[PDB]
Amino acid sequence: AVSKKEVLYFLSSKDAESSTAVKSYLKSLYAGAQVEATETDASELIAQLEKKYLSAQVVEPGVHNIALPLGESGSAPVKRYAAELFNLGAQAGFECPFIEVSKKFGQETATSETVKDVLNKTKSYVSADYNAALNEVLSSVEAEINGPVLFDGKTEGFKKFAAKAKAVAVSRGLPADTILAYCAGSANEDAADKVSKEFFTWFESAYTADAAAEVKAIEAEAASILDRHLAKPVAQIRKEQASAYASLLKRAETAKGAKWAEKYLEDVKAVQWFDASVAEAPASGPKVAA
Amino acid sequence: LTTFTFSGLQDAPVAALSGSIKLNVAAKAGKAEVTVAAGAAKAATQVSAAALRKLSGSKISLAEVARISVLHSSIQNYLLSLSNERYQLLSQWPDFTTMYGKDFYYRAHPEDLKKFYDAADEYYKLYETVTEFDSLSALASQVVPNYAARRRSTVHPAIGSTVADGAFTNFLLSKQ
Amino acid sequence: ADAKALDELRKPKFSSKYLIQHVSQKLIPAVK
């Protein structure tokens, strides 16, 4: 079973084996058994660590139930894949991904003094094609200031920097005006409706470019693995794939008592049973008890 | 779906668009008579407007019975649809069995006949490896783990370049 | 034997989920 801080994550997830374990947990609840008390302790580092290591347990069954739109025609298959990834993110506890990476910039640059510290300590969480375009404008404003541009906002030099960072930002293709006015909010919602429309149509364009870029990478990686695979004769392919499968089976059989090796061999028995069920009735597929 | 649906016998479909199955409704104010024509069988049913509202109560909740996963089935599907692209241009190789005769032998130069025989064996090697279709089920299992490690991030699964650029501009151009 | 279930088959099989659960169960009692 669980330690009951796992099981509060698995209530809203619609994955399969989380649902089966949580239905057995609710069945044990029905027969006069009590819930365990949530430990109201484990200060913020343990809270973020356990959150990070228990959101993996909801994204990782959730990724493998998401079918890629590899080589499909149009745009809307990528929108299916990216909407299903957004739904997986909302079921694993993460927020809307824009505000999630904005939260990460708030976590990384809480205590930065100058804009050069901002472009240093957040280099990995932003594109380098944009980070170089910001470091050049940082040097350009740094030459006229002849001092580091401090991270306040009251500065005139920071305003001259931001007026060209907005310029390179709209030069990249994202309209910075609608994004700043959306996340900065307005009072009357009828005047904010159009800026929410513009932010969302950019944001839909943006996450489709994200998911389609990952799909282009998977397309090229599968094409490269196949183009290296079709150069081999079948003797090398057969002995190679049988040896690699037997090596991973021996590696997952060297571990005993651990849960992951036991579940590994259990799912190996599942795929052997699936081959037997497709062999018994090739017109209907697998036998599913209804 | 949501817990409530708001459709049924109101702006409903009236006819069929195919001849493979024919559908004729007789929708009255209280009930409806759907006499559907389908092959050699035929059914004439009776549903009311509040009888279709009892449809979406217990939801269907479809799922995909897969061999390994739905992700790995999709990558294996793409590998098979690439092997079709390769196989279609092994379908346009010229026949050489029309030139296996001994009349083309002794008119042929020895080096060029040897290179023709090695070319034919090279075609047989290509065609034997491009139709090893049982190897794709493991060939896609090397594309999966880097992809699964790229969706298992510390921030969000579907996060990437341009959304991080938009939030970087939104983070920078605000007042500090 | 045959015709297992439906919910036994919707499980994505060779996902991780259990290396991570084992890492968490040998991490958090060792880091508290």
């Binding site: 993996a56 990995s124 094409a223 490269s224 190996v268 | 790995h72 692209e85 090397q142 298992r152 | 060779f14």
Partner: peptide
């Protein structure tokens, strides 16, 4: 068909490193 199970967390948000579409098809046409 089974994969090596990796449990590691990608910290960097980067472009996904598209590979080069290889020269197998031009080789087979050659």
């Amino acid at each position: 068909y089974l994969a090596p199970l990796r449990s590691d967390f990608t910290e960097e948000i980067t472009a996904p490193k598209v590979a080069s579409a290889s020269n197998l098809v031009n080789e087979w046409n050659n």
